[PDB]
Design a binder for this molecule. Structure first.
Ligand SMILES: O=C([C@H]1CCN(Cc2ccccc2)C[C@@H]1c1ccccc1)N1CCC(O)(Cn2cnc3ccccc3c2=O)CC1
Length: 324
């Protein structure tokens, strides 16, 4: 394969799956490597530790470990990971990093890669008041239950809600009202993170192992409020985060370079796999998170990274950390 795996400290759950997804977002990786953490405390800097993992994943020939990272952002209590969603963890990481890039030549890489804009709206049926609020997003959560595939989930996401009695809308000057709330997409990011809502509550939270489908390629101009002839919103499955069981095991399937050559990443064991094993076979063992990249940004996002693309201070500081 060439590619190298992560150690198990146990209970990390989705952490190892997320870390590889980030590592193989090549334009992220370079920018992480270009952050200025010369004079930072090794043991409680998130950005520093993210560089270690990234650097090791690039070079190490043995299973890489993550012990110091877990330490840096302080999830050590017996429930930390069980009690959170992937989107949460991600946010913890890319947050710290967005903030470390401020000032530098790579400032605002994260928003450039993962951020898009949304339009929430409420419209009154017989009366004239509309409320429009714009919103940035860095990920989106999709409805599964009673949905066959992605396309319905989007259709559902943009479905117009109604506001009848018992749930009538307070318009202030015009009192209670029958109204329609919806959501609509202004723009979709180069790198599209989608979470599948599989963990839901009942007489007591539970996992829905129901069959959900996703394609290799995903056109979203349908859902754009206004399209563009030159950059249309088609997307290429890069990553597929998988859980199996209940109480189980968390694996990720990637095609790092983008070419449709797949690999199963199970902690320390990375092995080549079929496309069927990464897509259909995880329709429902099944997927909870999906990563798509936009065809027009594929080459930039997944730009190649040399061993020279790491700075020297960085490299040296790490070498010495290993020695002792
Ligand atoms: O890793 C988990 C697990 C938490 C822990 N449980 C049991 C468990 C496993 C391992 C050790 C101890 C106990 C199993 C969870 C699980 C559920 C379903 C699919 C896979 C794993 N999760 C939570 C769900 C997830 O965040 C996906 N997502 C995102 N956003 C949502 C927004 C709104 C509504 C639902 C969701 C939702 O389900 C993935 C990470």
């Amino acid at each position: 394969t060439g590619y190298v795996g992560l150690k198990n400290q146990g209970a990390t759950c989705y952490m190892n799956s997320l870390l590889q997804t980030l590592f193989f977002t090549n334009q992220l990786r370079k920018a992480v490597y270009m952050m200025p953490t010369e004079g930072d405390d090794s043991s409680k800097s998130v950005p520093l530790a993210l560089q270690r993992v990234f650097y090791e994943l690039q070079h190490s020939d043995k299973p890489v470990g993550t012990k110091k990272l877990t330490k840096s952002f302080g999830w050590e209590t017996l429930d930390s990971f069980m009690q959170h969603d992937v989107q949460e963890l991600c946010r913890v990481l890319l947050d710290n990093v967005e903030n470390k890039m401020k000032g530098t030549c790579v400032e605002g890489t994260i928003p450039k890669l993962f951020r898009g804009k949304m339009v929430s709206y409420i419209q009154c049926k017989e009366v004239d008041y509309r409320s429009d609020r714009r919103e940035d997003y860095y990920d989106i959560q999709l409805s599964i239950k009673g949905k066959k595939n992605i396309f319905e989930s989007f259709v559902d996401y943009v479905a117009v809600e109604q506001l009848d009695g018992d749930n009538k809308y307070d318009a202030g000057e015009h009192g209670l009202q029958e109204a329609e709330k919806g959501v609509k997409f202004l723009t979709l990011p180069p790198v599209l993170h989608l979470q599948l809502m599989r963990f839901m509550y009942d007489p007591q939270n539970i996992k829905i192992n129901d069959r959900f489908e996703f394609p290799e390629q995903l056109p979203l101009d349908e859902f754009l409020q206004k399209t563009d002839p030159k950059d249309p919103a088609n997307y290429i499955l890069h990553a597929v985060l998988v859980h199996s069981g209940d109480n189980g095991h968390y694996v990720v399937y990637l095609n790092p370079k983008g070419d449709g050559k797949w690999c199963k990443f199970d902690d320390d064991v990375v092995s080549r796999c079929t496309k069927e094993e990464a897509i259909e076979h995880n329709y429902g063992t099944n997927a909870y998170m999906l990563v798509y990249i936009r065809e027009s940004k594929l080459s930039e996002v997944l730009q190649a990274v040399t061993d020279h693309d790491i700075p020297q201070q960085l490299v040296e500081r790490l070498q010495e950390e290993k020695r002792i």
